[PDB]
Structure formats: C-alpha cells, structure tokens
PDB file of C-alpha atoms and ligand atoms in Angstrom:
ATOM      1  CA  UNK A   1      -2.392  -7.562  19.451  1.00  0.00           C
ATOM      2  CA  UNK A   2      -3.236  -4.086  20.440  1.00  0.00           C
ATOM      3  CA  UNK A   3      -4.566  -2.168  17.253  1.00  0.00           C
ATOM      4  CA  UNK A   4      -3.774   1.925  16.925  1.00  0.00           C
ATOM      5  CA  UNK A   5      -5.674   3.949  14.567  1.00  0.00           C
ATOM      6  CA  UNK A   6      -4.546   7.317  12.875  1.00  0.00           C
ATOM      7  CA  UNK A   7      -7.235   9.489  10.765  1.00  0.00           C
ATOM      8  CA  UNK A   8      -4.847  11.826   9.570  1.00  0.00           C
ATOM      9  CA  UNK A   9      -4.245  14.063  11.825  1.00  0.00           C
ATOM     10  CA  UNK A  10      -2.712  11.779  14.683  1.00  0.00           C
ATOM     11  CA  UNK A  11       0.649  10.557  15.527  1.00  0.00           C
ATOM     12  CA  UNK A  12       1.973   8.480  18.466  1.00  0.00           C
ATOM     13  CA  UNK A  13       5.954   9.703  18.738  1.00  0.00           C
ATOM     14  CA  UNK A  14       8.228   7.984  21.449  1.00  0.00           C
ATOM     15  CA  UNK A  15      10.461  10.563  22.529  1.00  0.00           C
ATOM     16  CA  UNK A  16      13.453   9.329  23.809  1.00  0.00           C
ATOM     17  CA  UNK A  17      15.361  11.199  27.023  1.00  0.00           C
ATOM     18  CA  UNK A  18      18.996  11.438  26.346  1.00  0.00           C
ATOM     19  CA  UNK A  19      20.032  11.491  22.179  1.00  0.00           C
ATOM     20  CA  UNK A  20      20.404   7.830  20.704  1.00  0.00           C
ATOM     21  CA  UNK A  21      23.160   6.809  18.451  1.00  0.00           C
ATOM     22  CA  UNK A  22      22.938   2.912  17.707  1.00  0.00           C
ATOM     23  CA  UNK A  23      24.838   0.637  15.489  1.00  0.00           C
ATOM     24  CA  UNK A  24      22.325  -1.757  14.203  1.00  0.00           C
ATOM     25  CA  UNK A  25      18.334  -1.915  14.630  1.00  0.00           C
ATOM     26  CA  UNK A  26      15.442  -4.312  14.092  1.00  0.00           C
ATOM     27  CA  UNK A  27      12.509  -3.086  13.289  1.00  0.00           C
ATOM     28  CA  UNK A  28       9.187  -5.103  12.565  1.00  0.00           C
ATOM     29  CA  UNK A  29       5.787  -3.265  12.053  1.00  0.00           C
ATOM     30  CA  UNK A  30       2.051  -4.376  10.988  1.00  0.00           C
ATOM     31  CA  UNK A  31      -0.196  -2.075   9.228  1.00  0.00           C
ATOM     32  CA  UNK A  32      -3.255  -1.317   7.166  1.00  0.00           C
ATOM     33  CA  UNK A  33      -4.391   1.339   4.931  1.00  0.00           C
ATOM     34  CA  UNK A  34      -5.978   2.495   1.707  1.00  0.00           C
ATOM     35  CA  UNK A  35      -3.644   4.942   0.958  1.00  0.00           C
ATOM     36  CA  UNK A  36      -0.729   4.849  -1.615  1.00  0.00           C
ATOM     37  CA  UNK A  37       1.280   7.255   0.000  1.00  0.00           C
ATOM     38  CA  UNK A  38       2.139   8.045   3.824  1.00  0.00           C
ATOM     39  CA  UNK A  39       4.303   7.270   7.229  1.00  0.00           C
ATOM     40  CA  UNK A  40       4.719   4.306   8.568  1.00  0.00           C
ATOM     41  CA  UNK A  41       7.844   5.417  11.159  1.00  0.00           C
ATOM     42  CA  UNK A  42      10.858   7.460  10.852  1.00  0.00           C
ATOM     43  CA  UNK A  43      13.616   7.931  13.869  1.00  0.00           C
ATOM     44  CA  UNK A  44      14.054  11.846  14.062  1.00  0.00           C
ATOM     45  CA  UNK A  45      17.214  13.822  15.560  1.00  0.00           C
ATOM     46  CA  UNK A  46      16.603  17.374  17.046  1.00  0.00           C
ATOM     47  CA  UNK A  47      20.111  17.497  15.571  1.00  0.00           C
ATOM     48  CA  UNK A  48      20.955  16.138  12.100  1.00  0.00           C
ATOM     49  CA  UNK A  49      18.918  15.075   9.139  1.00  0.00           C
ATOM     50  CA  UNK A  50      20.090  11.287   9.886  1.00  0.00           C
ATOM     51  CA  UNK A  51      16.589   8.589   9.919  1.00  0.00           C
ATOM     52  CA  UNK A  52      15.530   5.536   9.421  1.00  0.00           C
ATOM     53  CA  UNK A  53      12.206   5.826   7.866  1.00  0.00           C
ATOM     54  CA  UNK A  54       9.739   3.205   6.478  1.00  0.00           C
ATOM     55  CA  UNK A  55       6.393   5.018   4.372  1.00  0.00           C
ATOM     56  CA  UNK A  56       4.029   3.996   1.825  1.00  0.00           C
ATOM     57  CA  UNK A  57       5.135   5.244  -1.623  1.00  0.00           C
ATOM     58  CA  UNK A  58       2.761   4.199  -4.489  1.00  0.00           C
ATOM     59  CA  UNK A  59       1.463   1.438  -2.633  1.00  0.00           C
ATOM     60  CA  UNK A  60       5.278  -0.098  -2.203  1.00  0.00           C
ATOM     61  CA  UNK A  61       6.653  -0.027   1.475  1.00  0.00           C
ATOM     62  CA  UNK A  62      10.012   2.873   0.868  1.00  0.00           C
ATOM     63  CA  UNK A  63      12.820   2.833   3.145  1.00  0.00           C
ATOM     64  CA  UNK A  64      14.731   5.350   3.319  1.00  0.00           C
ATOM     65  CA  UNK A  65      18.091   4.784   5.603  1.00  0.00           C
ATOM     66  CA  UNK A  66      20.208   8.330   6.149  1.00  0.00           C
ATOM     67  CA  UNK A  67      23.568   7.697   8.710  1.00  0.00           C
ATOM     68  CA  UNK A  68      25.249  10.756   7.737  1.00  0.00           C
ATOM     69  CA  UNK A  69      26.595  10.542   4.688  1.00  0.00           C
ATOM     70  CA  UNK A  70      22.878  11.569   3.155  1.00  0.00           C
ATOM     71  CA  UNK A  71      19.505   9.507   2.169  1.00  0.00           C
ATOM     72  CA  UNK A  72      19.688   5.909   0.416  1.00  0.00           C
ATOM     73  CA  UNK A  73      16.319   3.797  -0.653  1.00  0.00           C
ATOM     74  CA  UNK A  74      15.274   0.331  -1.067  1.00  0.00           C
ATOM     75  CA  UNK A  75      11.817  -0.332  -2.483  1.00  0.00           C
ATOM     76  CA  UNK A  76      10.094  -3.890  -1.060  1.00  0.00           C
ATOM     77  CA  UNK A  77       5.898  -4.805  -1.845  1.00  0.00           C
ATOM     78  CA  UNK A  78       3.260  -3.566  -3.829  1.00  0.00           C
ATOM     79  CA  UNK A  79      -0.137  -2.931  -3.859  1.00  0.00           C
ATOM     80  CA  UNK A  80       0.203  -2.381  -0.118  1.00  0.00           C
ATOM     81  CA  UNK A  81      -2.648  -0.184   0.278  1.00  0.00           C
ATOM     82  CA  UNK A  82      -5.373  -2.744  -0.457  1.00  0.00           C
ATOM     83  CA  UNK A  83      -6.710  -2.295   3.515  1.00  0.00           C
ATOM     84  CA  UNK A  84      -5.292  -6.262   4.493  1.00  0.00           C
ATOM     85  CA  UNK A  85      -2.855  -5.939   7.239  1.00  0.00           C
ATOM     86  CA  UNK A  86       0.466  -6.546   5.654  1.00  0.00           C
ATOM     87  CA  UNK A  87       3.807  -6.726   8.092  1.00  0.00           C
ATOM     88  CA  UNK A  88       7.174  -4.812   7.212  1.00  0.00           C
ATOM     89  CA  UNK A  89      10.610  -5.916   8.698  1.00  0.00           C
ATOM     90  CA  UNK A  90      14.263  -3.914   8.777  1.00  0.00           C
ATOM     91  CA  UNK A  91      17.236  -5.285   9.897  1.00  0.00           C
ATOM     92  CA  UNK A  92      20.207  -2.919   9.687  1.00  0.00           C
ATOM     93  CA  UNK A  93      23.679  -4.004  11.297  1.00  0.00           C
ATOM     94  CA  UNK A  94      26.071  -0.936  10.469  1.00  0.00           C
ATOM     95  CA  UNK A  95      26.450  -0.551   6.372  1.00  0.00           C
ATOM     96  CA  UNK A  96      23.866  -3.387   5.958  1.00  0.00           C
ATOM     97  CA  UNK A  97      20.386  -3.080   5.276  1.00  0.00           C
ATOM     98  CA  UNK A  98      17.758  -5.616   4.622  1.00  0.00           C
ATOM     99  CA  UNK A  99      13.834  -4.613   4.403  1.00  0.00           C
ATOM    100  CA  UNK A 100      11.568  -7.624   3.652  1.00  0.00           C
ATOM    101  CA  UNK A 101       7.517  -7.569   3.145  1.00  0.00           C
ATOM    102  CA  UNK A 102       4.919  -9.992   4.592  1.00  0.00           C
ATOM    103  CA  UNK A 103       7.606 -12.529   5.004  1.00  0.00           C
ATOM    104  CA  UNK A 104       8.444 -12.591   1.232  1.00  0.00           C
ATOM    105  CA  UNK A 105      11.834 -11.382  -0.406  1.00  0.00           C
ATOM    106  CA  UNK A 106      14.333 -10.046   1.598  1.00  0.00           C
ATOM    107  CA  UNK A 107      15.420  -6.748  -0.778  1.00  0.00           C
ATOM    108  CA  UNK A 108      19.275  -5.864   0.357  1.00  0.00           C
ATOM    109  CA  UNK A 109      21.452  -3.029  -0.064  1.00  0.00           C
ATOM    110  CA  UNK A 110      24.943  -1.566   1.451  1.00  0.00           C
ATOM    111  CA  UNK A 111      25.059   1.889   2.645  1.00  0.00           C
ATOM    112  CA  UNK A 112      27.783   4.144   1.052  1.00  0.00           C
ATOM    113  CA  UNK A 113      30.743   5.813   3.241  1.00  0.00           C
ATOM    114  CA  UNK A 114      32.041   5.624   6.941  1.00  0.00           C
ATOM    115  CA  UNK A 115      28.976   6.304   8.924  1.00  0.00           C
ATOM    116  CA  UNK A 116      27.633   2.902  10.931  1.00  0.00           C
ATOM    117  CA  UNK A 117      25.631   5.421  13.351  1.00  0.00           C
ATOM    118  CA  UNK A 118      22.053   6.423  13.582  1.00  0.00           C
ATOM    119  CA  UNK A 119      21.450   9.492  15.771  1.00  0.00           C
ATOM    120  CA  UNK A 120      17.915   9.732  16.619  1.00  0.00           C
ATOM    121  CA  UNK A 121      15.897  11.357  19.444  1.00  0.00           C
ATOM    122  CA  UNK A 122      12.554  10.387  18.625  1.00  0.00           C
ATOM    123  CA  UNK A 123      10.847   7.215  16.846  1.00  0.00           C
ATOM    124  CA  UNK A 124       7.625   8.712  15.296  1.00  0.00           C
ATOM    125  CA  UNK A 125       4.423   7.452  13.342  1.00  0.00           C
ATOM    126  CA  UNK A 126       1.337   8.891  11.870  1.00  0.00           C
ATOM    127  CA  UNK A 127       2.596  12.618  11.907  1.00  0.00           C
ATOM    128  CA  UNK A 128       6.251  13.682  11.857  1.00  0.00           C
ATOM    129  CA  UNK A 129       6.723  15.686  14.358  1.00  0.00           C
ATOM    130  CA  UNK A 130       9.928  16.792  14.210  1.00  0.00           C
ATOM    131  CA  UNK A 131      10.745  18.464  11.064  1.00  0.00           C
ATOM    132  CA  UNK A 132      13.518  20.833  10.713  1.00  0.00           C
ATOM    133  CA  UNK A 133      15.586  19.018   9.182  1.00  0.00           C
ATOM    134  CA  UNK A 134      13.272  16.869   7.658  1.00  0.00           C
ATOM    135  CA  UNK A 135      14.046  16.329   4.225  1.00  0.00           C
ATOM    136  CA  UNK A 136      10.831  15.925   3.056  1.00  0.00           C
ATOM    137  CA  UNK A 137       7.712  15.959   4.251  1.00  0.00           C
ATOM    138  CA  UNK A 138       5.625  12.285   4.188  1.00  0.00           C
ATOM    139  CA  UNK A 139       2.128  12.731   3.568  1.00  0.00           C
ATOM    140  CA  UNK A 140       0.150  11.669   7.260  1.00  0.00           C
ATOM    141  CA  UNK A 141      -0.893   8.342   8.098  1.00  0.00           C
ATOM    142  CA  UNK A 142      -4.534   7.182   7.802  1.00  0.00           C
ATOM    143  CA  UNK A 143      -5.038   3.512   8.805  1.00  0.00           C
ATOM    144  CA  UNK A 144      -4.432   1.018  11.194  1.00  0.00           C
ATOM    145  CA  UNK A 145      -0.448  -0.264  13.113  1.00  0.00           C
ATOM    146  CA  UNK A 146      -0.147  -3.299  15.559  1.00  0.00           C
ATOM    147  CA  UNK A 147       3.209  -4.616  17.330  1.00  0.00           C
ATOM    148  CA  UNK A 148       5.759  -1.918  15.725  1.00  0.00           C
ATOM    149  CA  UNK A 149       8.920  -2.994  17.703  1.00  0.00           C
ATOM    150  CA  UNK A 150      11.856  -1.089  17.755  1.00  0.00           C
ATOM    151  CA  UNK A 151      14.708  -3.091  18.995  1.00  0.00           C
ATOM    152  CA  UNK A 152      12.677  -5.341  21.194  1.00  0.00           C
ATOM    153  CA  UNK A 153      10.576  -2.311  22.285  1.00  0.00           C
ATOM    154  CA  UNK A 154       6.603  -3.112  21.711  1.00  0.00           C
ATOM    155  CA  UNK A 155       5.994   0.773  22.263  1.00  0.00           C
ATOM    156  CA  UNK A 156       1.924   0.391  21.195  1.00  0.00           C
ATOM    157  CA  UNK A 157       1.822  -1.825  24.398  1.00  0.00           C
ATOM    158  CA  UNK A 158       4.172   0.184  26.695  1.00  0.00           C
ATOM    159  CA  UNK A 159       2.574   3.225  25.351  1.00  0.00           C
ATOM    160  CA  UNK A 160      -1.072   1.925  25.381  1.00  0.00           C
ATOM    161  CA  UNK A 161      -0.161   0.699  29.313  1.00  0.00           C
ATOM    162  CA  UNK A 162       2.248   3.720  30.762  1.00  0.00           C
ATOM    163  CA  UNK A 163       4.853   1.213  30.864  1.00  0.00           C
ATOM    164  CA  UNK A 164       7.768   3.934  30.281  1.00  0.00           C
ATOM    165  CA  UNK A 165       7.309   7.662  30.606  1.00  0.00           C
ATOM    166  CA  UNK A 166       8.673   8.811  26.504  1.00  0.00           C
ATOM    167  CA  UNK A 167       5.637   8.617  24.663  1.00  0.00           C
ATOM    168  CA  UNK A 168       3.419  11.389  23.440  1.00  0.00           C
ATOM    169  CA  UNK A 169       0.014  10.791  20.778  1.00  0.00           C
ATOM    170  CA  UNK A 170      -2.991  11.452  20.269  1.00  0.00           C
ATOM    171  CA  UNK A 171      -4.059   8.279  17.890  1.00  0.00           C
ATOM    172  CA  UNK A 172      -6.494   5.723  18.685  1.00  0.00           C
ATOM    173  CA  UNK A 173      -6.115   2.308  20.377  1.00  0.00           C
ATOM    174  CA  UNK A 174      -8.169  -0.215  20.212  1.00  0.00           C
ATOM    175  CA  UNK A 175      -8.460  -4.207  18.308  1.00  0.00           C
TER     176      UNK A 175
HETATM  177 CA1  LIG B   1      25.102   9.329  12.010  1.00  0.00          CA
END
C-alpha cells in the first residue's frame, strides 16, 4: 500500500535496540526505479561486516548474503530499472538461500562454512548509514519501495504510523 520515495539523498533505517543475531529471515520488498545501480536494503552490525543486502546491479536485483565467513552473491532479474514496480523475495533458513524476482525463478545457493547467524543492528534502505565496516559502498537509492517486510515486520507502515519507536528517515511517503 503505502508508497516511500527516496531522491537520492534519503534513507529510512530501522534501528534496532539490543544487537540481532537470527537464524533464518524472510524478506519481501516492492520497488521502482530508473536506475541500474543502487540499495534496495542491507541489515548493518555496529560490529562485524556480516549483511544481508539486496541492490540493483546493472539492472539485475544482487544479493549479497555475508554470516561470517565473508560475502557470497546470487544474481535474480533483469532489466529491473525500467520504472514498473517489480517485487523481490529472500528466504534464508541457516546455509540456505533462495532470492526469487516478480514471482518468477527461484535462483538458489548454499552458503559456505559454519556460520548459520546474521548479526545485524540496523535494517537500512535508500542510504547506508552505517558504514565502517561496510564493504563497499552501494550507490543511493532514487525511486519508489512499498511493503518491504522483514520477518513479518511491514516497517513502511509501522514507520509511516509510529507504531514502534526504532525508525529514523528522512524519505518520502506517500501512494
Ligand atoms: Ca554471523
């Protein structure tokens, strides 16, 4: 439903109070844009270098899954950046990853060595925020999100409607 809009310059960042470390997480988000490159949302730790990140990479949707043991990527889409709202889904139950693109193909992969953890602190879009140990640096977000959920977590809504006291943005709701 509710529609949030990033120029560029504007992020939305859900900043969690006590460090997260989960075993699995769903993550579904819509979005639009004209851009080949930028963020879509990355988990950041204060603490390690470990994310799960979804961006635009030459109009393909890249995910990028670090536990611990350092980054792995699995490509899914293309021609993303055609300004149609497109939808992006990650399932990830410990070494298992699947990342599937307006409903089509579901790409799969299995992460390498013991980790099953994702540490995380924050759950960002538009900018990344957090950066220290940020591998690399996405290019910003310009273009439009709707219902990102983050294990059952609509945070546009519960941001949008001060339903929970974590988030912190400066990007632009509306439909
Ligand atoms: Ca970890």
């Amino acid at each position: 439903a509710t529609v949030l809009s990033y120029d560029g310059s504007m992020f939305m960042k859900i900043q969690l109070p006590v460090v997260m470390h989960t075993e699995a997480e769903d993550v579904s988000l819509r979005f639009r844009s004209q851009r080949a490159y930028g963020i879509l949302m990355a988990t950041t730790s204060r603490d390690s270098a470990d994310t799960l990140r979804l961006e635009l990479d030459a109009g393909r949707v890249k995910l990028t899954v670090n536990l611990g043991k350092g980054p792995e990527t699995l490509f899914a889409g293309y021609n993303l950046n055609d300004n149609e709202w497109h939808t992006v889904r990650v399932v990830r139950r410990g070494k298992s990853l699947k990342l599937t693109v307006d409903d089509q193909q579901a790409m799969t992969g299995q992460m390498a060595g013991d980790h099953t953890r994702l540490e995380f602190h924050n759950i960002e879009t538009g900018i990344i925020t957090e950066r220290r140990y940020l591998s690399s640096v996405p290019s910003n977000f310009i273009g439009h999100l709707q219902s990102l959920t983050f294990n059952g977590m609509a945070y546009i809504d519960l941001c949008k409607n001060g339903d929970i006291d974590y988030c912190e943005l400066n990007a632009r709701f509306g439909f």
